[PDB]
Design a binder for these strands. Structure first.
Ligand SMILES: Nc1ncnc2c1ncn2[C@@H]1O[C@H](COP(=O)(O)OP(=O)(O)OP(O)(O)=S)[C@@H](O)[C@H]1O
Lengths: 95, 85, 422, 326
DNA sequence: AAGGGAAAATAAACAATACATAACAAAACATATAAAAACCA
C-alpha cells in the first residue's frame, strides 16, 4: 500500500552462555591488538612530522604513506603559541 | 654512420613538459580559450578523459610542420638530413 | 628623465622600461605588456628597477595567489586605499568595503568613490599597478584581458591621481589574440648557454660558499687555509661543469637549474679530498657518478593478489585482441604502442575463465578485486564514475603501460608475448 | 531482413493485462510457495543469533524478496530482540531502493533523528559534512554499551539511486557501528561488483539464498516496456470533433490502400481535393490547422510528391479502422 | 598419405552507432534583509 513511498519508518540456553564467556574474552584480545597498530601508526607519523630542520627552509615537507588504506586518521601535538590544524580533501571534493 | 649520449625514458618527460608549454605541440581536441566567463565555467566542472589516460598516451598533435623546419634549421647542424624525410 | 638601474643581460630592456615609465602621468602610456616565458627573470628585472626608483610608488599584486577575477577586483580595491593611506596620511577618508565589490562595474564605481576625496593634492601623481602572471590565472578566458584594458578610460581623466597598469603574462599565443589593440609590448627573450651559466654563477656564489655543508667539510678535512677565492674557484668549477653535463636535459631554464644544484651539491661535497682542492679535473673524475645520472626520480612489483593478478593480465588482452579473433585463438577445445580499446563487462570473465590454471568456479572474490582495481585507477570507466555498477551502457579500459604488465606476467609465471602477434 | 516484431503481436489493453497477471501471481504455484516459506522459517533463530555480532546480513537469490524481508524484519525479529534485552519495540527504518527518489541527505537526516540527538549535532551541520557528522557519531559509539537500538532494511540494494557511489560509501560507515543491524537484499547478478575490500571491511557481509520466484508486484510498477504512439493516440481520437474522425478515416483509407511505411502515403494537394470532395476541407489552412492537431500529438508523419503517412503498422491501421473509427 | 573443400581470415566500401565534450538546467547549499509575529514588560 505504502511501499511506493520511500523509507517510511514504523514502530511495531545452557549452551549459548558458555559461548558468551568465550567470545568477548577473545574480542578483548582483538581490539587491544587493534589499538596497538593504531598507536603505532599515530606514533610514527608524529615524530617524523617534527624535528626535520632542513637548511633551505623554503620547502614544504612531504610524506608518502605507501600501502595505506585511505582511512588512516592522524592526531596532532598541541604545541602552544601556534595553532596546528588538519585539512582533509576527498576526491569527491576535488572538482 | 660514424658518440652521442642517447638518453633514457625517465628524463625525456622533463624535456617533453617544456615542449608542450612552448606550444610546439597541442592536445588533439582542446578548445583553448573560451570566449566569455560562463562558457569557461561550464568547462571547469567537466571532468576530463585525457588526463585519465596516462601522460605518454595523450595524443599530441603538431603546431609547426616538418617541411618548414628545413627552412629555419641551418645546414651546419647535424640533424639537417632529418628535416627532409 | 629617470634613474635607470643596471643588470646583467637586460641592457636593451632596461632602457625601454625606463622609456615607457615616468613619474609624470602624461608621458606614461596607459597599458603595457611585459612578455616572456618563465625563466627570464621578468619578476626579477621589474622589481630590480623599482628598488632603484624610490621616487615612484608601486602597488604589487599577485594573480597567481588568487584564483578568480571576482577576488581579483577585491584584491585591487583593498590595496589602493591601503597604499594611499601610507602615502598621504593627512587626507581624511570614508573608507569603503573592499568585500562589497564583486562585479566589474563595482570597481569603477568604488574608484569613483575613492579618488574624489584625494582631489586636493598638489600635482598629477601617477600610481603603477603591477599584475604578475596574468596567463596562469585558472579561470581566464578571451573577454577578461580586454576587460582590464579599458578600466583607465572609465575613470575620470582629470583626477589628481591616475591609475595605470603593467601586465605580466606568458604563452605568447595568448598575446597574438590582442595585437590589434597595439598596446606597447616589451618582449623578453630566452637565454643562451653561456648567459644561463653567467646568471647562475653570480646568483649562487652567495650560498654555496656559505653553506655549512662546505663549512663542515672545511673543518672535517685537514683544512689548509684555502681562500674564499679558492672557495670561489671550486664553486665556479662546479657551476661551469654542471651546466655542461646537463644543458641538453634541462633546456635554458633557471628554476630547473636552481634546484638540481641543490640536489647534487652535498653529494659533490663528500667526494672531495684535502688534495683535490688544487686538483679540479681529477676531482670531477672522482665525483663522476652523479654527473651522468639525473637523480630526480625518488618500477614496483605490485601489491595485488594472485586472482587479481590474472584479472589484470586478462584486461591487457583487449588492447589488441578484437572480438573477431579472440574466440578462435583461445579455444577450450602493433597496438602495443597504440591507445587501448574499450571493454564491456563479462568479456573479462570470458577471457578470465579461459586463461586460469573447471579448477575455479566461485566468482565472489573475482568480483571483489574489480572495484579494488577501480580504486587503484588501473582500469577506469569511460563515462562518469557513478552508475557503472548496474549494467547500463558502460565501457571499460586499462590504464597501465606495457612494461608493468610484462613484469607482472612473469611474476605469476604467465606468458603473454605469444598472444601479441602483429 | 524478414524479422517477426513486437509490433506484429496480438496486443492486450490495460485492464486485461493486469487482472490476469494478478490471477497467476496469486494462484499459479501457491501451495509450494508457502511450502518453501515454512521450510526457511526454521532459519529465523539462526539469523537472530548471528545478528547480535553486528553482522551486515545480505540476502541474494532469484525472485523478489520484498515480502520475505518485511515478514522477517517486522513481525519476527524486532519484538524478539526487545524481549530478549529485558516499552516500544525496536524502530524499523526500511529503505525502498526500487524507489528512485532516495537521496543521501534526506535519509541521513532521518537517521540522526532516529539515532540519539544527545549533543548539538546541528552545530556540526554546516559544504558536505555528512561523512564529517557520521565520523563524530562513530567514535562516540565505540565506547557505548553494546545493544541494538535500530534495525534498518534496504530493499533492492542495486536500485537506481542506492547504487550511486556516494550513497554506497555512506552506508559503509554505518555498518561498522555495533548498535545497528543491517539487513538488506539485492537482486542484480553483478551486485558484488559494488564492493571492494575497503567497503566489505566496513561491511563484514554474510550471504544467504532465498529463492521463492516471486512476481515482484511493487517492483514492476516503476519499470516500463512498450506496454506502458499506436497506443498513445488511441485515446485522443476518442475525444475530439466528429469531423476529425471522418478526415482521419479518409486519411487512413488511401494510406492503407497501398507495415505502414512512407510509400503508402498521399500527396497534400490531392488529399486537400479528396477532403474537398466529401465537403470536408474548405481549403489548405482549414485542413492543415486540424491536421496540426494530428501533428501535435504525433499521430501522423510527413516525408518527401508531398507524402503524409501514418507511422503505425499495416495491422494497426485496420485495427484503428474497425474499432475506433467505426 | 592425398586431397577436397568448408571454416576462417583479409580487405574494402559503406552504414549505423557510440563517445567526448559543450552548453545548460536544476537542485542542494548559503546568505541577507524588510516585514510579521511573538513576547516580555
Ligand atoms: N640579469 C639577471 N641578473 C641576475 N639574476 C637574474 C637575471 N635575470 C634573471 N635572473 C634570475 O632569474 C630568476 C628567475 O626569476 P623569475 O622572474 O621568476 O623568472 P620568470 O621568467 O619571471 O618566471 P616567472 O616567475 O613564472 S614570471 C630570478 O629570481 C633571478 O635570480
Amino acid at each position: 500500500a505504502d511501499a511506493q513511498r520511500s523509507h517510511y519508518t514504523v514502530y511495531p540456553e545452557k549452551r549459548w552462555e558458555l559461548y558468551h564467556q568465550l567470545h568477548s574474552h577473545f574480542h578483548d584480545q582483538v581490539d587491544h591488538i587493534i589499538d596497538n597498530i593504531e598507536a603505532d601508526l599515530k606514533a610514527e607519523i608524529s615524530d617524523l612530522l617534527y624535528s626535520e630542520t632542513t637548511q633551505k627552509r623554503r620547502c614544504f615537507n612531504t610524506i608518502f604513506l605507501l600501502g595505506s588504506d585511505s582511512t588512516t586518521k592522524i592526531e596532532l601535538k598541541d604545541e602552544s603559541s601556534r595553532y596546528n590544524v588538519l585539512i582533509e580533501l576527498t576526491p569527491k571534493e576535488s572538482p | 654512420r660514424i658518440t652521442i649520449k642517447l638518453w633514457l625514458k625517465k628524463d625525456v618527460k622533463n624535456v617533453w613538459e617544456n615542449l608542450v608549454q612552448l606550444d610546439f605541440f597541442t592536445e588533439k581536441s582542446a578548445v583553448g580559450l573560451r570566449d566569455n566567463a560562463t562558457a569557461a565555467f561550464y568547462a571547469s566542472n567537466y571532468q576530463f578523459q585525457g588526463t585519465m589516460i596516462p601522460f605518454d598516451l595523450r595524443s599530441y598533435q603538431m603546431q609547426i610542420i616538418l617541411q618548414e623546419l628545413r627552412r629555419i634549421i641551418p645546414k651546419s647542424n647535424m640533424y639537417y638530413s632529418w628535416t627532409q624525410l | 628623465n629617470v634613474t635607470t638601474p643596471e643588470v646583467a643581460f637586460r641592457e636593451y630592456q632596461t632602457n625601454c622600461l625606463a622609456s615607457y615609465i615616468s613619474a609624470d602621468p602624461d608621458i606614461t602610456p596607459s597599458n603595457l605588456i611585459l612578455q616572456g616565458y618563465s625563466g627570464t627573470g621578468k619578476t626579477y628585472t621589474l622589481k630590480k628597477y623599482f628598488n632603484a626608483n624610490p621616487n615612484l610608488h608601486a602597488v604589487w599584486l599577485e594573480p597567481v595567489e588568487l584564483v578568480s577575477w571576482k577576488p581579483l577586483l577585491q584584491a585591487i580595491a583593498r590595496t589602493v586605499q591601503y597604499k594611499l593611506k601610507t602615502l598621504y596620511p593627512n587626507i581624511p577618508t570614508t573608507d569603503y568595503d573592499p568585500l562589497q565589490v564583486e562585479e566589474p562595474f563595482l570597481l569603477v564605481k568604488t574608484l569613483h568613490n575613492i579618488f574624489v576625496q584625494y582631489e586636493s593634492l598638489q600635482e598629477k601623481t601617477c600610481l603603477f599597478l603591477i599584475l604578475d602572471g596574468f596567463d596562469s590565472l585558472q579561470d581566464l578566458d578571451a573577454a577578461l584581458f580586454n576587460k582590464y584594458i579599458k578600466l583607465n578610460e572609465l575613470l575620470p581623466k582629470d583626477s589628481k591621481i591616475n591609475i595605470k597598469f603593467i601586465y605580466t603574462m606568458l604563452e605568447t599565443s595568448f598575446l597574438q589574440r590582442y595585437s590589434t589593440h597595439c598596446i606597447p609590448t616589451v618582449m623578453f627573450p630566452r637565454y643562451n648557454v653561456d648567459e644561463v651559466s653567467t646568471i647562475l654563477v653570480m646568483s649562487r656564489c652567495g650560498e654555496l660558499m656559505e653553506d655549512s655543508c662546505l663549512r663542515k667539510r672545511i673543518i672535517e678535512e685537514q683544512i689548509t687555509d684555502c681562500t674564499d677565492d679558492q672557495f670561489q674557484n671550486v664553486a665556479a668549477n662546479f657551476i661551469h661543469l654542471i651546466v655542461q653535463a646537463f644543458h641538453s636535459y634541462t633546456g635554458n631554464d633557471i628554476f630547473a637549474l636552481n634546484d638540481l644544484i641543490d640536489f647534487k651539491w652535498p653529494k659533490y661535497v663528500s667526494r672531495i679530498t684535502k688534495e683535490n682542492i688544487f686538483e679540479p679535473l681529477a676531482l670531477y673524475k672522482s665525483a663522476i657518478k652523479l654527473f651522468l645520472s639525473t637523480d630526480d626520480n625518488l618500477s614496483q612489483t605490485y601489491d595485488l593478489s594472485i586472482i587479481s593478478k590474472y584479472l589484470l593480465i586478462a584486461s591487457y588482452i583487449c588492447s589488441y585482441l578484437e572480438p573477431r579473433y579472440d574466440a578462435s585463438i583461445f579455444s577450450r577445445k602493433n597496438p602495443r604502442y597504440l591507445q587501448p580499446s574499450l571493454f564491456a563487462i563479462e568479456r573479462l570473465l570470458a577471457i578470465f575463465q579461459a586463461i586460469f590454471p573447471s579448477l575455479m568456479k566461485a566468482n565472489i572474490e573475482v568480483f571483489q578485486n574489480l572495484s579494488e582495481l577501480h580504486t587503484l585507477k588501473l582500469i577506469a570507466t569511460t563515462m562518469n564514475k557513478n552508475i557503472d555498477y548496474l549494467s547500463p551502457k558502460v565501457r571499460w579500459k586499462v590504464n597501465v603501460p606495457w612494461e608493468i604488465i610484462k613484469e607482472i606476467s612473469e611474476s605469476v609465471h604467465f606468458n603473454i608475448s605469444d598472444y601479441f602477434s602483429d | 531482413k524478414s524479422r517477426h516484431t513486437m509490433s506484429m503481436a496480438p496486443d492486450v489493453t490495460r485492464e486485461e493485462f493486469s487482472l490476469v497477471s494478478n490471477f497467476f501471481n496469486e494462484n499459479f504455484q501457491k501451495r509450494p510457495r508457502q511450502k518453501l516459506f515454512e521450510i526457511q522459517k526454521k532459519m529465523f533463530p539462526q539469523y537472530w543469533f548471528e545478528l547480535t555480532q553486528g553482522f551486515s546480513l545480505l540476502f541474494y537469490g532469484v525472485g523478489s524478496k520484498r515480502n520475505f524481508l518485511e515478514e522477517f524484519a517486522i513481525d519476527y525479529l524486532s519484538p524478539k530482540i526487545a524481549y530478549s534485552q529485558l516499552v516500544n519495540s525496536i524502530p524499523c527504518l526500511i529503505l525502498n531502493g526500487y524507489n528512485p527518489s532516495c537521496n543521501y541527505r534526506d535519509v541521513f537526516k532521518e537517521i540522526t533523528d532516529l539515532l540519539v540527538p544527545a549533543e548539538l549535532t546541528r552545530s556540526e551541520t554546516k559544504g558536505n559534512h555528512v561523512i564529517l557528522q557520521i565520523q563524530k557519531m562513530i567514535d562516540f559509539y565505540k565506547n557505548q554499551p553494546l545493544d541494538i537500538k535500530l534495525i534498518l532494511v534496504v530493499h533492492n540494494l542495486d536500485g537506481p539511486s542506492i547504487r550511486k557511489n556516494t550513497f554506497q560509501t555512506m552506508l559503509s560507515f554505518l555498518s561498522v557501528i555495533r548498535q545497528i543491524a543491517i539487513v538488506a537484499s539485492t537482486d542484480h547478478i553483478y551486485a558484488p561488483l559494488l564492493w571492494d575490500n575497503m567497503k566489505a571491511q566496513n561491511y563484514n557481509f554474510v550471504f544467504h539464498d532465498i529463492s521463492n520466484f516471486e512476481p515482484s508486484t511493487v517492483e514492476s510498477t516503476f519499470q516500463d516496456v512498450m506496454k506502458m504512439g499506436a497506443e498513445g493516440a488511441k485515446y485522443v481520437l476518442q475525444s475530439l470533433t466528429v469531423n476529425s474522425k471522418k478526415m482521419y478515416k479518409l486519411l487512413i483509407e488511401t494510406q492503407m490502400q497501398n507495415r505502414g511505411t512512407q510509400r503508402t502515403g498521399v500527396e497534400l494537394k490531392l488529399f486537400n481535393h479528396l477532403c474537398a470532395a466529401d465537403f470536408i476541407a474548405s481549403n489548405e489552412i482549414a485542413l492543415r490547422s486540424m491536421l496540426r492537431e494530428f501533428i501535435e500529438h504525433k499521430m501522423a508523419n510527413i516525408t518527401k510528391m508531398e507524402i503524409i503517412w501514418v507511422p503505425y503498422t499495416y495491422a494497426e491501421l485496420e485495427k484503428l479502422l474497425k474499432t475506433v473509427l467505426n
